Design a protein around this ligand. Structure first.
Ligand SMILES: Nc1ncnc2c1ncn2[C@@H]1O[C@@H]2COP(=O)(O)O[C@H]2[C@H]1O
Ligand SMILES: Nc1ncnc2c1ncn2[C@@H]1O[C@@H]2COP(=O)(O)O[C@H]2[C@H]1O
Ligand SMILES: Nc1ncnc2c1ncn2[C@@H]1O[C@@H]2COP(=O)(O)O[C@H]2[C@H]1O
Ligand SMILES: Nc1ncnc2c1ncn2[C@@H]1O[C@@H]2COP(=O)(O)O[C@H]2[C@H]1O
Lengths: 203, 200
DNA sequence: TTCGAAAAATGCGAT
DNA sequence: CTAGATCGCATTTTTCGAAAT
DNA sequence: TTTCGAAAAATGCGAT
DNA sequence: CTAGATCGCATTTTTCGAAAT
């Protein structure tokens, strides 16, 4: 932390959420902004039957609930769920705008994050439009294997995730994921036992 | 609109005829665009050349903003003119200088990125949750309620090819063709050539 | 580090 | 022709809270 | 400112 | 099973720019 973060937080209300809890409900009126002090969350949307699609994972340093800031009468566009325990700062849009008046760098930071999220989401549209499930899963496994929470392994990198969650990322049933992971292992591209998956030749 | 006039006085104005390329995907991003007149399409292509439309943008919209917040970024997509366009262009360097004297310019830009993220997230949901028939129906209906839609005694009228609908929903032109025939069979639309009447 | 539920995840497979 | 979604249960595998170290 | 005949672009095939 | 992608071309629309009154 530094004097700027402390200055910012002194204008916020800090709350702690346990793993699996819901921070933002899709459809509710948006009047506040959040800043992740510690922890990680998953951004998701769902269909009429409850099927879920994960749009993104966010971490400490990331703002959340920002899309309603620029125009009143807006509703939350997605659900945000705590992936681990989280410490989150909350502030009304009304007061956040006053803070921008005294220190506009805060808007620059928020804007940069939205820009990155738009590039990532546009790429997802492409993957879904141009790639079959095998290609989407293959790319998703390589991407996770290169994140900072991924563990090293003599044959490449190791990650821990369920077939169901992979299905929520790539847009397919958990059964299809399971059948493809076995084919990938037969082709000796990976090794998977339980939630532990080893991605080979990532190095 | 003092700021708007102030902003434009620092830009270079260019014109692009319909179908021309304003932004090439993969090239280095160093300049920001602002549409003064006309409309464009933002699209991505696969290795085989198939295309997918991410969005249509119109007068008042910024373009090429994604490479501004990080160094060494490349254009994330192609931008092609749909109609003849009049566009204001300014370097990232100079734009940053304008942000300093009046950060409200960044506010208007951020507001558009916020809306584009909401829209693109909705598109992800549609691609993952709806079959082609459902995606085509929603698209026909949204197009029919846009300002450029024509009045018709049976509802609203639009003009578009089966190939373009295919680039919007992510399916082959042949599939769009078969689905439009089935939707006509259900009396939801009437299609002759590029002209489609959405009953209402 | 440990151990026994509790609860979560997984395999099924011809249409 | 090629890809995938389904569905009800019985089995695995993982998580969790408190003892044991 | 209407009309018209190419080029160009778009569409149907439809069992596999 | 249900949903969609494919391919080689002849045929059906659209788009255009030049010619007229
Ligand atoms: N097209 C899709 N088909 C099936 N499940 C999907 C799809 N898109 C997203 N999902 C979600 O991904 C999840 C993967 O595990 P489940 O089969 O339990 O439930 C699935 C849905 O919630
Ligand atoms: N595509 C996305 N990528 C990343 N974060 C998103 C995306 N869509 C929505 N969000 C976040 O989820 C939040 C849900 O509530 P808001 O709409 O207020 O603000 C949204 C963003 O912070
Ligand atoms: N899954 C897809 N299958 C086919 N075409 C697609 C797909 N996704 C995007 N497209 C594009 O949309 C276009 C629709 O018409 P075409 O079949 O001529 O060419 C198609 C591609 O350029
Ligand atoms: N999902 C999207 N919705 C709207 N506009 C987009 C989207 N993705 C990219 N763009 C625009 O297309 C531009 C391509 O170049 P840039 O990446 O510089 O900036 C991008 C945005 O201005």
């Amino acid at each position: 932390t530094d004097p700027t973060l402390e200055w910012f937080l002194s204008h916020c209300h800090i709350h702690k959420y346990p793993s699996k809890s819901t921070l933002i409900h899709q459809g509710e009126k948006a009047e506040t902004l959040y800043y992740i002090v510690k922890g990680s969350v998953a951004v998701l949307i769902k269909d009429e039957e409850g099927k879920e699609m994960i749009l993104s994972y966010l971490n400490q340093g990331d703002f959340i609930g920002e899309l309603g800031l620029f125009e009143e009468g807006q509703e939350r566009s997605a659900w945000v769920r705590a992936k681990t325990a989280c410490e989150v700062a909350e502030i009304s849009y009304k007061k956040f705008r006053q803070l921008i008046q005294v220190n506009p760098d805060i808007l620059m930071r928020l804007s940069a994050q939205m820009a990155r999220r738009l590039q990532v989401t546009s790429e997802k549209v492409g993957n879904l439009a141009f790639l079959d499930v095998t290609g989407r899963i293959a790319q998703t496994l390589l991407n996770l294997a290169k994140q900072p929470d991924a563990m090293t392994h003599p044959d490449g990198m190791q990650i821990k995730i369920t077939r169901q969650e992979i299905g929520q990322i790539v847009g397919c049933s958990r059964e299809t994921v399971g059948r493809i992971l076995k084919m990938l292992e037969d082709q000796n591209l990976i090794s998977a036992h339980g939630k532990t998956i080893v991605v080979y030749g990532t190095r």
